[PDB]
């Protein structure tokens, strides 16, 4: 709560120190950040990320703790549940490579990105304009004073009308525009981060690509490609690639160590991609001046 | 092995053969309480005199608390061994043959029931030994170098 | 070589001293003098015979990084057959010491396997290599916060 | 005489199942009790600093 009041002069605090080997001059030394005893300064940059995405007090965090704690409890149930008989999937269920790629592409990657757009324009963006929206009242407030219309008509050209002014203070209403989806591309002048209204648009844009990319493969309804067929069909004439991709369907779809290899390779790249983009295009407010973070 | 002076001699073979661990013909409860007496009264020194409170007037009562715990931990480390190295109804694993060749009784200590008796001897002796140091060293406390 | 490059280029930028990288970064002694040696002045003073600072914990971890890393070599260089002959002598000494032949290993002691040593040796090398750099990265930057 | 005096006064601590429970549970309670009720003048952490805080570089951040 204090760090919010001045992000550039209050060391974020990670936790408290209680080590009964500490002597007295250490107890003094590690007391900082405006605490009462020794503490550790948080360098994981959580403080800025939760500022941006709309959290504002301690109390939001406590329910944030409980909810995730509940989600953890739910998962532990599932790991037990799917070992008993009459709840364990058969082989053919796991080896269904088509029906899985539809859901993962359209449901997992897809809807989640659409819903995160929902949170950005129902809580986050309103937070950065002085509006405190929570589960108590989020039915009264309108994301855009004419909301839910302009989209139905077809003149979506209103949600980018009047964006945040150049002279904006991140936590209050000065210069606060009313646009929710924009395309500005610059930096927020005060906080040296990407604009909120761009990031809402981008998660909305790629919320569509995956949804439409999700209906490719055939599951039960007689339309859509067969991944076995696509591999066979791509056999170059002239023989330079031999029999081409014939038979790679079974070899992948029967070797776990193959599937894991591909997953790691793709995951290995984008993590480097994440590292390269974050430091150039700071996506969280007041994180380009916390040099250590 | 080899018979050197150290491994065999009247003085050596009388010293070892008459301390509780080797008096194979007495009850393992007492063999536990002697052992805990000598060890317990032993280590009260370094905790009290070299601990982190030696300067403070609680050096007497901070060493004793330290030694008391260490006896308790070894009591656990004793019980873990007894419960994992013997079975409740299996006989003794001690050698039953003396050097002369007389086949003597197997030691009761090397037995689940015996060892559980022995640790009862060690623990009670360990705390009793470590208080007896504290009483002497801070009541009858003149001559010592403390 | 990647994180080194990112840190030094930025640590000169944040101070507004961008000339220092652009000249020293063409010869190796520039990297050793102007980045390693120079920027670790505040870290190593985490605790000295004059006093301590907030940076002491990072100074301690810094050496702790050097220690695990240097233990890594022990498992990579010295291979198994030497240690196995060393255990056998030890497992003889324990079997002949009086008062200590009363305690018997349940699982016989052997030196680590050939693959295990490589894995263990690499575990130390990696852990020591992360902790060392992670301490220098945080302390040096946070020392100046710029 | 020492045999009989010792033999009866160490019997409760002998059954290895019970000795293991009381050692950990009782001990774990005692460790809890000693630290939660130690004097602040023998544990530096248990007392606060009670001294002014030194600001960090670049203001307080």
């Amino acid at each position: 709560e204090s760090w919010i009041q001045d992000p550039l002069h209050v060391r974020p605090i990670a936790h408290a120190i209680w080590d009964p080997h500490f002597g007295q001059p250490a107890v003094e030394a590690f007391t900082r950040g405006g605490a009462a005893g020794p503490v550790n300064i948080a360098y994981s940059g959580v403080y800025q990320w939760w500022y941006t995405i709309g959290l504002r007090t301690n109390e939001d965090l406590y329910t944030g703790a409980l909810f995730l704690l509940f989600l953890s409890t739910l998962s532990l149930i599932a790991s037990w549940l799917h070992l008993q008989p009459k709840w364990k999937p058969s082989l053919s269920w796991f080896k269904n490579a088509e029906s899985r790629l539809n859901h993962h592409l359209s449901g997992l990657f897809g809807v989640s990105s659409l819903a995160w757009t929902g949170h950005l324009v129902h809580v986050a963006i309103p937070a950065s304009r002085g509006e405190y929206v929570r589960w108590n009242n989020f039915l009264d407030v309108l994301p855009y004073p004419q909301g839910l219309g302009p989209l139905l008509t077809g003149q979506w050209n209103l949600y980018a009308q009047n964006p945040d002014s150049s002279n904006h203070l991140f936590g209050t209403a000065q210069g606060a525009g009313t646009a929710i989806l924009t395309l500005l591309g610059g930096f927020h002048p005060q906080t040296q981060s990407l604009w909120l209204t761009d990031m809402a648009h981008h998660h909305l844009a790629i919320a569509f690509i995956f949804l439409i990319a999700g209906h490719m493969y055939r599951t039960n309804f007689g339309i859509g490609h067969s991944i076995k067929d696509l591999l066979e069909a791509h056999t170059p004439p002239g023989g330079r690639l031999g029999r081409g991709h014939k038979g790679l369907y079974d070899t992948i779809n029967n070797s776990i160590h193959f599937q894991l290899g591909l997953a790691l390779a793709s995951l290995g790249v984008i993590t480097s991609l994440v590292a390269q983009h974050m430091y150039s295009l700071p996506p969280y407010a007041f994180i380009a001046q916390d040099f250590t973070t | 092995s080899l018979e050197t002076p150290v491994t065999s001699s009247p003085l050596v073979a009388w010293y070892l053969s008459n301390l509780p661990a080797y008096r194979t013909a007495v009850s393992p409860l007492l063999r536990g309480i002697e052992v805990g007496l000598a060890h317990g009264y032993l280590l009260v020194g370094p905790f009290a005199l070299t601990g982190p409170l030696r300067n403070t007037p609680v050096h007497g009562q901070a060493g004793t608390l330290g030694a008391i715990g260490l006896v308790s931990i070894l009591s656990v480390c004793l019980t873990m061994y007894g419960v994992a190295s013997f079975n409740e109804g299996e006989p003794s694993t001690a050698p039953v043959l003396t050097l002369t060749g007389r086949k003597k009784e197997a030691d009761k200590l090397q037995t689940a029931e015996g060892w559980s008796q022995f640790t009862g001897g060690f623990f009670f002796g360990g705390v009793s030994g470590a208080v007896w140091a504290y009483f002497l060293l801070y009541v009858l406390d003149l001559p010592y170098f403390f | 070589w990647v994180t080194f490059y990112w840190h030094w280029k930025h640590i000169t930028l944040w101070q507004g001293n961008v000339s220092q990288f652009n000249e020293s970064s063409t010869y190796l002694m520039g990297w050793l003098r102007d980045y390693l040696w120079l920027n670790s002045s505040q870290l190593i003073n985490g605790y000295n015979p004059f006093g301590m600072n907030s940076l002491s914990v990072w100074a301690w971890m810094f050496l702790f990084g050097h220690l695990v890393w240097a233990t890594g070599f022990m498992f990579l260089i010295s291979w198994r057959g030497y240690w196995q002959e060393l255990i056998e002598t030890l497992a003889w000494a324990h079997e002949r010491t009086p008062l200590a032949n009363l305690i018997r290993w349940r699982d016989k002691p052997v030196a680590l396997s050939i693959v295990q040593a490589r894995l263990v040796g690499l575990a130390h090398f990696s852990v020591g290599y992360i902790f060392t750099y992670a301490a220098f990265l945080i302390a040096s930057t946070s020392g100046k916060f710029g | 005489l020492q045999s009989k005096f010792f033999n009866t006064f160490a019997a409760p601590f002998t059954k290895r199942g019970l000795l293991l429970k009381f050692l950990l549970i009782g001990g774990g309670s005692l460790v809890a009790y000693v630290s939660a009720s130690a004097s602040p003048d023998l544990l530096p952490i248990k007392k606060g600093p009670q001294l002014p805080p030194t600001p960090g570089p670049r203001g307080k951040i």
Binding site: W18 | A84 | - | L24, V31, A32, A36, K46
Partner: peptide, 30 residues
């Protein structure tokens, strides 16, 4: 207050019971 109890429990007791619990399980025989 609360740290002074929970730090020892996870630092001293919870390790001890853990090590002694595994040691029996590892060294069992059936």
């Amino acid at each position: 207050n609360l740290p002074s109890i929970f730090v020892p429990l996870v630092g001293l007791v919870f390790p001890a019971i853990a090590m002694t619990s595994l040691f029996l399980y590892v060294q069992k025989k059936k």
